[PDB]
Swiss-Prot record, chain B:
Name of the encoding gene: SERPING1
Site description Reactive bond for chymotrypsin, residues in chain: 344-345
Effect upon mutating residue 224 to R: In HAE1; phenotype consistent with hereditary angioedema type 1
Function of the molecule: Serine protease inhibitor, which acrs as a regulator of the classical complement pathway. Forms a proteolytically inactive stoichiometric complex with the C1r or C1s proteases. May also regulate blood coagulation, fibrinolysis and the generation of kinins. Very efficient inhibitor of FXIIa. Inhibits chymotrypsin and kallikrein.
Annotated site (Reactive bond): 345-346
Protein name: Plasma protease C1 inhibitor
Effect of residue 308 to R: In HAE1; phenotype consistent with hereditary angioedema type 2
Residue numbers of the full-length protein present here: 122 to 499 of 500
Result after altering residue 333 to E: In HAE1; phenotype consistent with hereditary angioedema type 2
Organism from which the protein derives: Homo sapiens
Localization per record: Secreted
Swiss-Prot record, chain C:
Spans through the membrane: none
Annotated glycosylation sites: 117
Protein name, as recorded: Complement C1s subcomponent heavy chain
Range within the parent protein: 292 to 436 of 688
Sushi domain: residues covered: 4-68, 69-134
Disulfide bonds: 6-53, 33-66, 71-114, 98-132
Top-level taxon of the source organism: Eukaryota
Amino acid sequence: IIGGSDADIKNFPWQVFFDNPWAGGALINEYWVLTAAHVVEGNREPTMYVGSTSVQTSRLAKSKMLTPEHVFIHPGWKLLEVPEGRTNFDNDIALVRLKDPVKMGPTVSPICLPGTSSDYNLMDGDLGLISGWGRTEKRDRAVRLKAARLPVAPLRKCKEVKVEKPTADAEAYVFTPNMICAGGEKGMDSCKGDAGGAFAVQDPNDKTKFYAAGLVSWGPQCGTYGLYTRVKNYVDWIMKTMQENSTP
Amino acid sequence: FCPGPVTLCSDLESHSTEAVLGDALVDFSLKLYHAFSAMKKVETNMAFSPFSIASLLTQVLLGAGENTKTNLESILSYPKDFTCVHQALKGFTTKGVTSVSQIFHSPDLAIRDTFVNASRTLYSSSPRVLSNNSDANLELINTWVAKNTNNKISRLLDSLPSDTRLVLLNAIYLSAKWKTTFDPKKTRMEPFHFKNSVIKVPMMNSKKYPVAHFIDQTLKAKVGQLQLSHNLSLVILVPQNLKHRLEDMEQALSPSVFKAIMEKLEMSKFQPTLLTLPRIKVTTSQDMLSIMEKLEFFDFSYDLNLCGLTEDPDLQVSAMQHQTVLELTETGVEAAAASAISVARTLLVFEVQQPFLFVLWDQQHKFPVFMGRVYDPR
Amino acid sequence: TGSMPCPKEDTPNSVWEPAKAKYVFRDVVQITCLDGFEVVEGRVGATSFYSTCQSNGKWSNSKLKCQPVDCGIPESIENGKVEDPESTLFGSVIRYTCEEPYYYMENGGGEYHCAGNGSWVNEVLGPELPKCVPVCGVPREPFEEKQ
């Protein structure tokens, strides 16, 4: 979270923290956590934490750790592809099933999901919040939670001049309609260590709640612009996954 | 009765038992770890080489018989009639270390000729004789070790018995280093959790070091791998939270968990990781006879049956000592590879800042070369 | 000899199946309790029992009386609570609620009433207890963008 301010865990009780893939997450209900596909890519069993202002090593031992049961990746993702996502990050979304339910309180409560109507269709002029322990301007690691307000920018401002030759320059990053562009204002953006964070947007119908409109996926030079996974396009897959893998 | 000297195996038969040898070298390592922890204090560093140890035990198993031949096979997790283990062990030798295995005997212990050559061929060393007075035998052993170890292991023994008849020795140091050099300018004093306080130890640092890692649930620990030279690699197992003591991680390591983790690391790709860990510099001298009794092996002090080596009826192991001098600092091979550009908005990290367990692994023949723990980097 | 007849019985919670009148000696009757009642034959509550007009002129099994069915103290639910009523007998009604800002149930759960079978039931949810799932998207502390 570059260009952002401090924020207690009460500002983002849905913000899950991930260890091996030092990344972010999003609680949606008592049994499932939403994150990016590349977050739980090479780690089929993440290390998750909730309800903590700080992620000091002295704090994670006294914070609630979630025990995952199974990791569900969206089928439109890459596979054994060597870390460099040179091909794409299309369908960069994943669901994590928890073995134990989550007791909700003042520092842990889940965020809503985007509705299937057309009001939830993101566009210019809309605003959003990003929260994560990613890299700010000072250090690469944020011990206490940071947050910044980002507007939905046109995807034209995303396609930027960034080296895209991890291996064969022939491979070119493709931009899909399943991605949302944001940032630009005051240079506020999401950097390394924010993947899986929810792009919290206020519900247009119930203006007191919030819903995860995007998940921090990829982008060029951080601090400029980037790409968040459009969650509205995967609402049918999240529901078809939570109901099939019932809790018997 | 004594079973005759063992028969030489063919190159394909011995190459066929490579998968058999690599599996018993894992079961035997775990038995040595539980023994070493039961002998040292509760929170002490230790480093032992389970490979060089078994290389000398099978050198003994060559001339054993009756109960001594079977107990050595059950201690070393060997199958019966495993006649190709001697040649298979010689082939497992890695150039990343420099180890020695000698057997010293008093002048009144006659060595059979069927073993003088069988030890000089299958292990390149015949039994060496000792002097007459015990005073010269002490310095004769330490100098022979200080000569054939490039002056690394100087004081392998602190004392020798007056009635010394049978001495087993093995000293090994690590000459291999990292395949990727560490920057010494980035060596910052980072905190390190010790006991319950926070001590500061010298720690190496690298923003994009190639580390293949993941999480294992059976251990509740982060398992990372680092690439050395000579087809060697150092595996490091750190508990996830501080809630899990290293002791709880020790009691959870089974032969199944071991083999289920090394086979998952052989198929996990090395990725540019941000890494921070203290220097590894552990030396451990240990009376190995105390280890044999800690594994319910009471043959070296009672009812010793070594007919293939000697025909002496009254024979017992007078001493047996091991020393491992493992050291790894900011020295490496390929300075760096760079080539970074990951556009993903995530962070990859592996951090060893608490008591941990390390295993130096040989990826080629698949077996643990070294094995130990570090409770205090100081 | 004179077969002494057994008189009838004030049966407010029971009904005599043979019924008729002038019950003669060696005449068994099925005393069945109504919905919401059970005869505790000393152990498990069965819905009915039997009584025979003996040679004296009174009914056997007179120690059995149809008593109100007890539903028992209601079992609590996860992230929920229920107020202890005055009685746990038939017809008594209880009420389940969730937590205040972090749970809201499903709905719907219009309270539960002790039924005749002996279980607590709701109009639609039946014998199924309500569940308290989290009230989603509730920021405990509003986030002020320090600028």
